[PDB]
Design an enzyme around this catalytic site. Structure first.
Site, mmCIF file in Angstrom:
data_model
loop_
_atom_site.group_PDB
_atom_site.id
_atom_site.type_symbol
_atom_site.label_atom_id
_atom_site.label_comp_id
_atom_site.label_asym_id
_atom_site.label_seq_id
_atom_site.Cartn_x
_atom_site.Cartn_y
_atom_site.Cartn_z
ATOM 1 N N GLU A 35 5.688 -5.529 4.952
ATOM 2 C CA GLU A 35 5.347 -4.117 4.807
ATOM 3 C C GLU A 35 6.156 -3.400 3.734
ATOM 4 O O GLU A 35 5.638 -2.520 3.031
ATOM 5 C CB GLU A 35 5.530 -3.338 6.117
ATOM 6 C CG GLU A 35 4.521 -3.614 7.228
ATOM 7 C CD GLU A 35 3.079 -3.264 6.882
ATOM 8 O OE1 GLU A 35 2.808 -2.755 5.772
ATOM 9 O OE2 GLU A 35 2.206 -3.510 7.739
ATOM 10 N N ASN A 46 -2.156 6.258 -0.098
ATOM 11 C CA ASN A 46 -3.514 5.757 0.072
ATOM 12 C C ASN A 46 -4.451 6.855 -0.415
ATOM 13 O O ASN A 46 -4.716 7.813 0.302
ATOM 14 C CB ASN A 46 -3.771 5.465 1.555
ATOM 15 C CG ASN A 46 -2.774 4.464 2.135
ATOM 16 O OD1 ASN A 46 -2.786 3.284 1.782
ATOM 17 N ND2 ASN A 46 -1.894 4.939 3.010
ATOM 18 N N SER A 51 -3.358 9.661 2.884
ATOM 19 C CA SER A 51 -2.220 9.455 3.792
ATOM 20 C C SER A 51 -1.165 8.640 3.048
ATOM 21 O O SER A 51 -1.446 8.088 1.990
ATOM 22 C CB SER A 51 -2.662 8.702 5.052
ATOM 23 O OG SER A 51 -3.033 7.365 4.750
ATOM 24 N N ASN A 60 2.225 5.007 8.875
ATOM 25 C CA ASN A 60 1.301 5.949 8.254
ATOM 26 C C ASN A 60 1.274 7.387 8.765
ATOM 27 O O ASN A 60 1.255 7.650 9.977
ATOM 28 C CB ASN A 60 -0.100 5.332 8.269
ATOM 29 C CG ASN A 60 -1.087 6.114 7.435
ATOM 30 O OD1 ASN A 60 -1.772 6.998 7.943
ATOM 31 N ND2 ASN A 60 -1.150 5.803 6.147
#
Length: 130
Positions: A35, A46, A51, A60
């Site tokens: 990650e 994104n 987000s 997120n």
């Protein structure tokens, strides 16, 4: 802060992550590795849904933390997304625990499904004394 592998393994263990809701320390490590590369400052915007993924676990903003700029987002961990960018990962760990209390468990992160599920993850904790 960018953690070294074993340093992170012990840090997570001290924070109560080993076996949390059935999730092994090696699974948490594989998650953080894929990650963020163990980078607490990692961020991913994104553009599709406006987000942002924050911190070591790329949590997120649409659902877990508040950054004030994500459309119709919620804040399930009840934290400012800034709390997920600290060198100290206590708040990020608290939030990650919150994520896995939901139905999907560790599967909440698609990256875990792609890079950790049904994989040999022993290498993440070997030699760390955990």
């Amino acid at each position: 802060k960018v953690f070294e592998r074993c340093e992170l393994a012990r840090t997570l263990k001290r924070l109560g992550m080993d076996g949390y809701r059935g999730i092994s320390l090696a699974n948490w490590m594989c998650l953080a590795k894929w990650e963020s590369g163990y980078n607490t400052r990692a961020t991913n915007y994104n553009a599709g849904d406006r987000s942002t993924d924050y911190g070591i676990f790329a949590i997120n903003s649409r659902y877990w933390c508040n950054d004030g700029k994500t459309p119709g987002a919620v804040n399930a961990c009840h934290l400012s997304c800034s709390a997920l960018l600290q060198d100290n990962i206590a708040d990020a760990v608290a939030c990650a625990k919150r994520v896995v209390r939901d139905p999907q468990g560790i599967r909440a992160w698609v990256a875990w499904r792609n890079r950790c599920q049904n994989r040999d993850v022993r290498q993440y904790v070997q030699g760390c004394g955990v």
